[PDB]
Amino acid sequence: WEIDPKDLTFLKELGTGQFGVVKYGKWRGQYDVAIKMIKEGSMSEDEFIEEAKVMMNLSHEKLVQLYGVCTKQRPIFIITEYMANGCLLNYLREMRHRFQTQQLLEMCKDVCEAMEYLESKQFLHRDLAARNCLVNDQGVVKVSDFGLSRYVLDDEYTSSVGSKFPVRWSPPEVLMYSKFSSKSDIWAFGVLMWEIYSLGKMPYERFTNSETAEHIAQGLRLYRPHLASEKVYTIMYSCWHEKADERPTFKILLSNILDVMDEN
Numbered sequence: 687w688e689i690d691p692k693d694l695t696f697l698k699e700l701g702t703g704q705f706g707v708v709k710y711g712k713w714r715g716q717y718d719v720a721i722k723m724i725k726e727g728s729m730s731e732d733e734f735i736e737e738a739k740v741m742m743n744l745s746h747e748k749l750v751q752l753y754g755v756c757t758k759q760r761p762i763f764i765i766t767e768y769m770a771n772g773c774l775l776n777y778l779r780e781m782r783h784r785f786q787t788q789q790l791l792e793m794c795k796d797v798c799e800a801m802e803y804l805e806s807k808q809f810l811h812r813d814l815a816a817r818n819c820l821v822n823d824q825g826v827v828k829v830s831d832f833g834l835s836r837y838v839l840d841d842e843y844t845s846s847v848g849s850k851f852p853v854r855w856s857p858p859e860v861l862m863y864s865k866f867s868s869k870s871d872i873w874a875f876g877v878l879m880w881e882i883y884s885l886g887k888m889p890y891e892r893f894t895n896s897e898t899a900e901h902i903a904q905g906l907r908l909y910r911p912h913l914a915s916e917k918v919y920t921i922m923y924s925c926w927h928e929k930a931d932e933r934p935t936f937k938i939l940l941s942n943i944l945d946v947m948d949e950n
């Protein structure tokens with residue numbers, strides 16, 4: 687879906703990410719959208735447009751909805767569903783004292799449902815983390831920017847020893863061999879659950895990225911946050927098996943989460 691740029695009205699700046707400036711605006715005067723304006727040289731653009739069709743076809747309530755792209759001018763635009771409460775990490779930190787435990791579990795469920803959908807389509811996120819989830823005006827969490835890490839042109843982000851690589855969300859086989867799979871998204875999801883239940887703390891705080899890699903390679907795992915029950919911690923901890931094939935699927939994780947809800 688090629689969006690006509692004449693149908694976009696820019697309204698507000700939303701900050702800057704791995705591809706440069708992001709704006710809030712409207713599509714056809716009515717629908718609230720976010721618009722990434724892709725900084726030249728920041729993205730493998732031919733590669734992105736080449737593979738853009740499969741992303742058009744991903745649709746789930748808990749996935750941020752793609753509206754489309756503008757590719758007939760530079761900078762390229764990516765147009766998505768606007769999420770008025772912004773990214774999940776800042777939302778957790780700003781509302782930290784208000785959350786009930788049942789709401790923390792519901793946020794995890796939202797993300798798990800989106801990821802079970804992506805898993806069913808054999809589509810990898812590759813940078814799942816609370817910073818890449820968004821929150822709407824009703825508090826629903828949705829997964830954002832799935833698959834886009836593949837198109838980043840920035841050695842600090844693409845190298846496992848780069849300053850911007852998501853080391854703290856990565857399993858050993860990604861840090862050692864760059865072996866991304868559904869099971870590396872599973873690992874990241876466990877870290878995301880930890881971010882939720884810690885109310886937005888930084889994983890492995892005071893460890894450097896390389897110290898993090900060393901310690902998880904040797905079996906260290908994130909501690910149980912105060913607000914996580916044992917049953918909840920067992921779920922997130924299952925995401926962190928050293929061996930990828932021992933980690934659950936998102937279907938199983940979703941069933942575990944629903945089971946905890948039912949018990950509650």
Ligand SMILES: Cc1cc(Nc2cc(-c3ccc(F)c(NC(=O)c4cc5c(s4)CCCC5)c3F)n[nH]c2=O)nn1C
Nearest residue numbers: 700702703704705708720768769770772813831834835
């Ligand atoms: C109050 C409020 C609402 C609101 N709502 C939104 C903000 C954004 C948004 C803004 C800046 C960003 F930097 C990003 N992330 C990125 O650009 C990238 C992430 C990744 C990229 S690029 C390539 C590698 C993989 C990860 C955003 F997603 N989008 N959509 C929204 O709805 N924001 N605020 C402040």
